[PDB]
Write a protein that binds this DNA or RNA. Structure first.
Ligand SMILES: O=c1ccn([C@@H]2O[C@H](COP(=O)(O)OP(=O)(O)OP(=O)(O)O)[C@@H](O)[C@H]2O)c(=O)[nH]1
Ligand SMILES: [Mg+2]
Ligand SMILES: [Mg+2]
Ligand SMILES: [Zn+2]
Ligand SMILES: [Zn+2]
Lengths: 73, 928, 182, 186
RNA sequence: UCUCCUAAGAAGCUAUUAAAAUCACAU
RNA sequence: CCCAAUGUGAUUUUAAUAGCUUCUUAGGAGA
């Protein structure tokens, strides 16, 4: 069911990036949109988990946007 | 041995280097297309030819060329007959050589008539191969495209080389035929002048002209007064017409001295009236057409004259500059200040039109005049900045603001509590037949303009007019069931007034504001003004936010309230009559519930013999649709106005509809663009005009299926007579035959039974006739959409069914099942399980993710899920029980939270019926 | 008056009920009481009917009063827009195209091409930039234009030195170029 | 039941049934039936008022719940989405997602989007030598459960640092946090 | 005196239809 | 900020009419 868990996590992850005002950067939003739309159309879990590492790396690069040390505890 | 002396005589007095194309003294055999009408057979069909011996030239260094000598064995009288006709018509440069001679075969003298330096194929083979296109049988078209240097033989190894949408470069490969065809057109006018000045009478047909343009076979002409020569041309130009735009034939009219090697004509930029150029073009190519042409359609006599004259204007309006079309504007004084406003229009189809109620000086403006000025784009476009937008190929007018607007689309919200519940019930396991396929797709700022650019696919398209003027009378027989006409503002019904009024009013309020601000005499005065004047209007493009199985964006046209308010007052009496009728071809207004699905299928199955089921769906129906077919759809709906509107009133309403929902200044991203053609989906008649267009293509496919069948092979004398009468009514009678239109409608309605709803259709048809070519099949639709819609219809979008106990594969995105219900069996509709599960998991608002606020949302989805319980796949049947188990959970949690919040119980315990099957079963049983 | 008749008949019947003077006379007082009550029920029902009609009259008047206020507000908003757009038209550049026309009438599409003082160019890639807008002045619509500003899709100002084949992957395309007729 | 009029209705129907069962004269039964009819009519009038007033309360509770709870769902949306995401990423249990999340807690954050194709370029911040000791070995860097080739290393002042200088003893001389630039190995 | 029918007013219930708001689906 | 045309179904509320039931009033008929 990871196939479906990965597709559902992609919808929640782009909703978090949209709320952090990433749309205010056209050069960066156009990449997040492409990674999101590719994970939904994917058929192999190895493609979807590699595109999920690229999409999650956007959120981790925004230092101080989310308190990750508090969200992991 | 003796064949060498014959080969040397076929060369004649000329220098020629001939080689025999078969056995040396017997005739050759070939399969070719012919336009034929005779006492025994009629049609435009492909037949075997056996009366000719063929020779081909080698060049001066031993290689073959497209230059044939074609000899023929004739009787004695006809041999002399053709000779006499040729001698008189000999000095025309449009005529091929005719060598009349004799020679000994089988021990006796036989006459022969040799025609010199012909091409391999004729104009009829080029016309047939582009009309009757089959992607598995292209060998004649491929040899014409290569023999005449349109493309290399390697071009056909490309994926989907023929497809206008996946390989748009094919429009450049077909356009390399343009000068070849335009020379043949010229040579026809030289030949008609020669026949007239020589005193010759006869019908001229595409099979008697080569692909250089030369005429031959004069054995069916007769002599008359030398000044009374008359050439018959109705079927020649009408069969050829759709090929003239496909090959862009008149493209050499744009150049100085009409030479493709010289520069373009620098037209005067202020010029809007081209009436004398349109009349010059008609006499250049169509001199002998024998019907009155009106360059401006305000001068036409009836609907059929408007369709005639607009078909020539779609050809000629390709020569003139794009800046010449659209609103015509004039300077006018209101209380001493100068306004710029529209006082006419110039249409690509209808010509120049001028408004009748123009005032050059005014003291004050009423609310009705402020609405017209506000809607008029003139003031918006004349005060805006110039715009060069390189993101699209569509023509850009002006930018209304100093900044460009970019609109994005966000993802859908995830309803985790329903998904966690479904997974606990065993859903979404790997390898399961049910899985998530419907989602909300995000989009970047270029989304809007990217969807608007698909209007590229709308190409100018000239029709066969002899065919369209018969099809339009059979299409109208499907609408004799309904009443129609104009109504007052007192009688107009509006579904929801809390919706956008358009541009530029969406800045002051919603449709309700205007409907409340204007009394019924301001509304009736605004309607009566449109029967005498053209109001051009701006249309918004709005992106759509909804769930889908494919990632492309969707945009909808926000049509302005001057247009919406007055089109509704003209059409609504008819549109309400189409939705109130039952048992007709058009199924708008019929519910799927309480048996209605079984009633619709028992109606299309009718009393058809050897019946089979099939269906299709138009690709980019709004984008592709030709302007000639969107004009015809409005004329067919307007036929109800004979009692209340004059010929002049019915014109301006048409002109209005063209100025507001066909050719438009679309506003997108805060900037104005000219829309090229096709539907706008916020048009008041959208679903009803789609249904008229869908009947027209299905009537056309049956005219083509029967006229392209060999009449000598038809066994039933009733159908030979039907094919023979159909050719006369189409290509030789010039007025409508009411007795035949009723007979062809009755034939069609027994053997080919339809059910239609916008761009979606189901057909039940006689398979014994369809396999013999006596009615349409899917290959006859592939062919018609190619030359009449500019789209290749992929077999992945079509279907057919042999067993009627299974019903149609898909109609309105719903599958069918035959199931027992009580004492008898019925057809029920069922959805795709991923559409129903996807709508539960993903939502368009954050508050929709708490189920205790939204219990009635799950009750509605369970009504659509109920028929799945009767499916043989247990993974489908479990989807309904998932929804009923969830509705119970939501009521237990709602009751717990209500008691914790107020310490007092809810008194409405009636919710208990929504988690039991009896409430849902009753939605699919008759007698309500 | 029917209520007063009913109330006075109630007091006249209630004294006879207290002493039970005579069933016969009780009926006489009782019939006069219930006849008065019938007239009172007719009048009270009509009072309640008229009381409901008063709200229907006032609520229809408020819907008329709110509809005239909204007409009067949008009429002056449509006039404020029209008389504002009118103060932008190039009244000298515009008179010279309209006076040259055969009949004083022209296509709308030529008005921005021939009279607009300002041009917006929207550019999707560097190949399109190099072909259309290269340098600082350029020709379009048979006239000469000078670039006054460039901005990217994020509306940040781009200097003409930053637009090159090497740096193009770093910019936020499309660029929007603003130029003045020169 | 227990409305004020119910005792009159109940005692009247009991007396009417008792009289017909006892065989009492029809004029008595008519007086009992009539006094029952009026008591019953008053009870039905009281019960109609009760059922109307109870609907008035049940609608008020229902619409007040929907109002107060629609406010709650829309207010805490930023804290709900972030909490939901980090709950779902645990269930996936992928080695690459676990590796980058565990590194980001310590501050070993990437400056680029992490690229998928071979020989593409990555840049990563290294907070201290105690991070370097775990992620790096010789010319190699290990991140997102892949191997990367270190192209160059850069100090907080944008000065280049050689791979031989990074050691526990020499670590106080470098201006942390350090930046490592690397390329995806095959 | 009593019963029934007819006519009117009030209270109550049920049924049907219309209208308004809301949710869902189809092109 | 923007948020079209059209059809169908469900749920809630309100309004109008029909039937039934009770009381009061009035008139006649039978006894
Ligand atoms: O929301 C909608 C959908 C559709 N329509 C109208 O119904 C027509 C057919 O709607 P379809 O759902 O068939 O879509 P489409 O043909 O436009 O696109 P494809 O998926 O076939 O490529 C459209 O062309 C439009 O006119 C609307 O008016 N509104
Ligand atoms: Mg379609
Ligand atoms: Mg279909
Ligand atoms: Zn005409
Ligand atoms: Zn009319």
């Amino acid at each position: 069911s990871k196939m479906s868990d990965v597709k559902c996590t992609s919808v929640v992850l782009l909703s978090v990036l949209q709320q952090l005002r990433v749309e205010s950067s056209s050069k960066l939003w156009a990449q997040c949109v492409q990674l999101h739309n590719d994970i939904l159309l994917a058929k192999d879990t190895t493609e979807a988990f590699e595109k999920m590492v690229s999409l999650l790396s956007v959120l981790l690069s925004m230092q101080g946007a989310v308190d990750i040390n508090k969200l992991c505890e | 041995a003796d064949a060498q002396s014959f080969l040397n005589r076929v060369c004649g007095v000329s220098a020629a280097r001939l080689t025999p194309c078969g056995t040396g003294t017997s005739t050759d055999v070939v399969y070719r297309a012919f336009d034929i009408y005779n006492d025994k057979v009629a049609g435009f069909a492909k037949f075997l030819k056996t009366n000719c011996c063929r020779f081909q030239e080698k060049d001066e260094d031993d290689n073959l060329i497209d230059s044939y000598f074609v000899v023929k064995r004739h009787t004695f009288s006809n041999y002399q007959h053709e000779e006499t006709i040729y001698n008189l018509l000999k000095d025309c440069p449009a005529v091929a050589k005719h060598d009349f001679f004799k020679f000994r075969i089988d021990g006796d003298m036989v006459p022969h008539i040799s025609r010199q330096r012909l091409t391999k194929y004729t104009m009829a083979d080029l016309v047939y191969a582009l009309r009757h296109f089959d992607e598995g049988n292209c060998d004649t078209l491929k040899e014409i495209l290569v023999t005449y240097n349109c493309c290399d033989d390697d071009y056909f190894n490309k994926k989907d080389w023929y497809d206008f949408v996946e390989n748009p470069d094919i429009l450049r490969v077909y356009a390399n035929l343009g000068e070849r065809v335009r020379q043949a057109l010229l040579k026809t006018v030289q030949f008609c002048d020669a026949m007239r000045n020589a005193g010759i009478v006869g019908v001229l047909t595409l099979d008697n002209q080569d692909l250089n343009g030369n005429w031959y076979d004069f054995g069916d002409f007769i002599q008359t007064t030398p000044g009374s020569g008359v050439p018959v041309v109705d079927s020649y130009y009408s069969l050829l017409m759709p090929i003239l735009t496909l090959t862009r034939a008149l493209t050499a009219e744009s150049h100085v001295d009409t030479d493709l090697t010289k520069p373009y004509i620098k037209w005067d930029l202020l010029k809007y009236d081209f009436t004398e150029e349109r009349l010059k073009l008609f006499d250049r190519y169509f001199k002998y057409w024998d019907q009155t042409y009106h360059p401006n359609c305000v001068n036409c006599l009836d609907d059929r004259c408007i369709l005639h004259c607009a078909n020539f204007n779609v050809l000629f309006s390709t020569v003139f500059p794009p800046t010449s079309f659209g609103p015509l504007v004039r300077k006018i004084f209101v209380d001493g200040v100068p306004f710029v406003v529209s006082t006419g229009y110039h249409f690509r189809e209808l010509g120049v039109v001028h408004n009748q109620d123009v005032n050059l000086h005014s003291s004050r403006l009423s609310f009705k005049e402020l609405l017209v000025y506000a809607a008029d784009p003139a003031m918006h476009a004349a005060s805006g900045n110039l715009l060069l937008d390189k993101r699209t190929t569509c023509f850009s007018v002006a930018a209304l603001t100093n900044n460009v607007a970019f609109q994005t689309v966000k993802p859908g919200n995830f309803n985790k509590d329903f998904y966690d519940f479904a997974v606990s019930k065993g859903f979404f396991k790997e390898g399961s037949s049910v899985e998530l396929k419907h989602f909300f797709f995000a989009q970047d700022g270029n989304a809007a303009i990217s969807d608007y650019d698909y209007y590229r696919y709308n190409l100018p398209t000239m029709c066969d007019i002899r065919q369209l003027l018969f099809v339009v009378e059979v299409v109208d027989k499907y609408f004799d069931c309904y009443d129609g006409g104009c109504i007052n503002a007192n009688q107009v019904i509006v579904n929801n007034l809390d919706k956008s009024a358009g541009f530029p009013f969406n800045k002051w309020g919603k449709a309700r504001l205007y409907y409340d601000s204007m009394s019924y005499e301001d509304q009736d005065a605004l309607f009566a003004y449109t029967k005498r004047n053209v109001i051009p209007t701006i249309t918004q493009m709005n992106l759509k936010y909804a769930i889908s199985a494919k990632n492309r964006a969707r945009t909808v046209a926000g049509v302005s309230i001057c247009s919406t308010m007055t089109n509704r007052q003209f059409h609504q009496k008819l549109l309400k009559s189409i939705a109130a009728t039952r048992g007709a071809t058009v199924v708008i207004g019929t519910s799927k519930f309480y048996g209605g699905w079984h009633n619709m299928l028992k109606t299309v199955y009718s009393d058809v013999e050897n019946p089979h089921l099939m269906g299709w769906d138009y690709p980019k129906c709004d984008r592709a649709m030709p302007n000639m077919l969107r004009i015809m759809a409005s004329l067919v709906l307007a036929r109800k106005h004979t009692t209340c509107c004059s010929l002049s009133h019915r014109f301006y309403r048409l002109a209005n509809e063209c100025a507001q929902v066909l050719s438009e200044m679309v506003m997108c991203g805060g900037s104005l663009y000219v829309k090229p053609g096709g539907t706008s989906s916020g048009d008041a008649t959208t679903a009803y005009a789609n249904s008229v267009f869908n009947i027209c293509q299905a009537v056309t496919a049956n005219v083509n299926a029967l006229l392209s069948t060999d009449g000598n092979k038809i066994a039933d004398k009733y159908v030979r007579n039907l094919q023979h009468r159909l050719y006369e009514c189409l290509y030789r009678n010039r007025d409508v035959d009411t007795d035949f239109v009723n007979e062809f409608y009755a034939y069609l309605r027994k053997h080919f039974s339809m059910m239609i709803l916008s761009d979606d259709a189901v057909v039940c048809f006689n398979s014994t006739y369809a396999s013999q070519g006596l009615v349409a099949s899917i290959k006859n639709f592939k062919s018609v959409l190619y030359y009449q819609n500019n789209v290749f219809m992929s077999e992945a979008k079509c279907w057919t069914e042999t067993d009627l106990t299974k019903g149609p594969h898909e109609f309105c995105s719903q599958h069918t099942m035959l199931v027992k219900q009580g004492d008898d069996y019925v057809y029920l509709p069922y959805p795709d399980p991923s559409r129903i599960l996807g709508a539960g998991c993903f939502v368009d608002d954050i508050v929709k993710t708490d189920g205790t606020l939204m219990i009635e949302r799950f009750v509605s989805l369970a009504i659509d899920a109920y028929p799945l319980t009767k499916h043989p796949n247990q993974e489908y049947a479990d989807v309904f029980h998932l929804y009923l188990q969830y509705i119970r959970k939501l009521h237990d949690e709602l009751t717990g939270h209500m008691l914790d919040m107020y310490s007092v119980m809810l008194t409405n315990d009636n919710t208990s019926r929504y988690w039991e099957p009896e409430f849902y079963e009753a939605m699919y049983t008759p007698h309500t | 008056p029917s209520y007063a008749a009913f109330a006075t008949a109630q007091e006249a019947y209630e004294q006879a009920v207290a002493n039970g003077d005579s069933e016969v006379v009780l009926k006489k007082l009782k019939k006069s009481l219930n006849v008065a009550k019938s007239e009172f029920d007719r009048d009270a029902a009509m009072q309640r009917k008229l009381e409901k009609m008063a709200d229907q009259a006032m609520t229809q008047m408020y819907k008329q009063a709110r509809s005239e206020d909204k007409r009067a507000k949008v009429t002056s908003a449509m006039q404020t827009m029209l008389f504002t757009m009118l103060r932008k038209l190039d009244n000298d550049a515009l008179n010279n195209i309209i006076n040259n026309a055969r009949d004083g009438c022209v296509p709308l599409n030529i008005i921005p091409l021939t009279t607009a003082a300002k041009l917006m160019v929207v550019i999707p890639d560097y190949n399109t930039y190099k072909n259309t807008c290269d340098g600082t002045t350029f020709t379009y619509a048979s006239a000469l234009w000078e670039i006054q500003q460039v901005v990217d899709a994020d509306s940040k100002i781009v200097q003409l030195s930053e637009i090159s084949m090497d740096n193009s992957p770093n910019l936020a395309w499309p660029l929007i170029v603003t130029a003045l007729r020169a």
